[PDB]
Write a protein that binds this ligand. Structure first.
Ligand SMILES: OC[C@H]1O[C@H](O[C@H]2[C@@H](O)[C@H](O)[C@@H](CO)O[C@@H]2O)[C@@H](O)[C@@H](O)[C@@H]1O
Ligand SMILES: OC[C@H]1O[C@H](O[C@H]2[C@@H](O)[C@H](O)[C@@H](CO)O[C@@H]2O)[C@@H](O)[C@@H](O)[C@@H]1O
Ligand SMILES: [Cl-]
Ligand SMILES: [Cl-]
Lengths: 317, 317
């Protein structure tokens, strides 16, 4: 049998110190900044920040540090690690990024020996894992493996049943008919109106800049019933994380004009702006068949419309 | 027995003066600005500007004018005209728009008699038609009737075969493998890369703000061939006027690593941004079955990508 994993991690160095694990495996967070302190025959310490705000130091800093700051969407293209030649510490880190950056931090006295080039997977670095004490005994960088799909699913809007939506009226057209005869009359009125419907689900920028996130979700919809407006949780379908859809809404109406009456026809549409929290599950499927999933929450913003409405008012003359 | 038309025009007033027709039915231009001069027993004159820059005056101005300036997307919601009550001149114009505006210009001495409320169709005003001399003898506002669909089709890119595409390399990943044994080795490498493809076809903003324009067109594509970068006119399909499609592009590669050899693998993708002219036909189908079409020209802008490329280099160590 053959085992695959959604992350790629190759740890280099010795067996001393105490284990550490500092990664976004739980929530999709990525490595956002790293400080590296070197010594004569080791990497001395590493401080790392993840995109979710976590910040931890391993080993004991001495001297000044080298820094690398990753921008959202910046991924590794390559990584090599060296031990210290004696098999007892990490000795050097070298990487390059898809934004043209390079970084090289190495011990200062002892010469570098065997280079270990790594497969960065997708290039999205989830953090670092190794062992430290006084120094960095060993370390590796964890990557998400190449991705087949990244999907936001199991979406809920937990406040949707409490929400009272503000629905603004857009006038489309009004016209007046006059029936001076003693028999009812029929008038056809055709209406068209462009509507622009939008949906967006917020996501940490690092993740959404690196991966094309598809959304499997119902969205909020708006309708006008007898008792007023009603919000509903629509049927689940596929969306992009930010989605806009234009269409020409149309309607054909037959207006009845009673004898000796004026009828005014008022044709309108209601526009609603949703701004409410959502929860869901991010499901990553790797090319190698493995999966990584985690729960998330953010803000849904949406613009939705009612059906075109026709109201008629009758008057004399 | 029954004729329908893509335009709706009801002329009110008398039979004197000379005929005029000032409308965008040739090119989809709309009424952008109107000045109206009134007199005691008539509308005296009207000056009109269409969205394509045309500007004409009908009748002979006297005194100050009233103005209405339409913004892109602003459509009529209602319109009423009055004669001067004697059947010899236009007497008043009243309209309301979908941005909440209202305008009422009327003769100043004689009182208004019969109101003629009009059906504004889609609300998109193409211009004015009537008869003028000293005064406005008669006039009507021409509207596009309610729309079923509006499509940009028959799209060509007249320069596409002359264009030399500027393709930027984006690095995805590099890794090295070593084979110290005297027997063949294989290494599987999987790659994923987010690509964001875009297409946009420029259009006069008054039209595209009012109508949901679908595009039935092929789009420029880019490929890597033996000599260099081959552009091509892709297969026809449906798009929106500004479109974005993101995807995780992926590839699995089996790398052969010979005995006593080092193989470096360099994985890239090419991104090109097209900027070139297009021609096509705007076809409007009204709800009543009629059609208005006209030829148009604009600028297409597109971002497109090559396939993921794998470059393999053999070293000896
Ligand atoms: O990270 C290196 C090393 O750090 C700690 O050991 C330190 C010290 O306490 C020891 O006396 C000496 C000798 O071995 O070395 C270090 O300075 C420990 O955490 C150790 O496990 C670790 O390898
Ligand atoms: O637009 C009104 C009227 O204008 C012109 O006629 C003017 C003038 O030339 C005539 O002498 C007098 C009297 O008949 O009326 C106007 O002042 C013409 O273009 C006419 O056809 C038009 O109705
Ligand atoms: Cl070593
Ligand atoms: Cl009249």
């Amino acid at each position: 049998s053959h085992m695959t994993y959604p992350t790629n991690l190759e740890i280099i160095g010795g067996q001393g110190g105490s284990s550490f694990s500092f990664t976004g495996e739980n929530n999709g967070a990525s490595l956002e900044k790293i400080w590296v302190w070197v010594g004569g025959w080791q990497i001395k310490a590493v401080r790392a920040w993840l995109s979710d705000g976590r910040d931890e130091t391993f080993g004991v800093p001495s001297g000044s540090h080298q820094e690398y700051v990753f921008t959202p969407g910046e991924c590794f293209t390559s990584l090599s690690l060296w031990g210290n030649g004696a098999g007892t510490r990490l000795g050097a880190i070298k990487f390059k990024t898809n934004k043209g950056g390079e970084f090289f931090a190495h011990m200062t006295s002892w010469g570098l020996k065997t280079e270990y080039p790594m497969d960065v997977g997708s290039g999205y670095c989830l953090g670092i894992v190794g062992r430290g004490g006084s120094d960095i005994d060993c370390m590796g960088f964890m990557f998400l493996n190449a991705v087949q799909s990244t999907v936001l699913t199991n979406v809920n809007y937990p406040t949707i049943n409490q929400l009272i939506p503000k629905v603004a009226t857009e006038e489309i057209k009004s016209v007046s008919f006059e029936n001076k005869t003693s028999v009812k009359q029929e008038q056809k009125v055709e209406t068209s109106k462009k509507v622009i419907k939008t949906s967006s689900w917020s996501m940490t920028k690092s993740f959404s800049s690196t991966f094309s996130v598809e959304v499997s979700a119902g969205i909020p919809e708006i309708a006008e019933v007898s008792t007023g407006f009603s919000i509903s949780f629509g049927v689940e379908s596929t969306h992009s994380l930010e989605q806009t859809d234009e269409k020409n809404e149309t309607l054909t109406t037959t207006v009845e004009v009673p004898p000796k009456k004026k009828v005014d026809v008022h044709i309108t549409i209601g526009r609603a702006s949703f701004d409410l929290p959502y929860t869901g599950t991010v499901k990553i499927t790797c090319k190698n068949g493995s999966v990584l999933q985690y729960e998330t929450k953010g803000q849904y913003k949406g613009v939705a419309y009612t059906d075109i409405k026709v109201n008629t008012v009758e008057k004399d003359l």
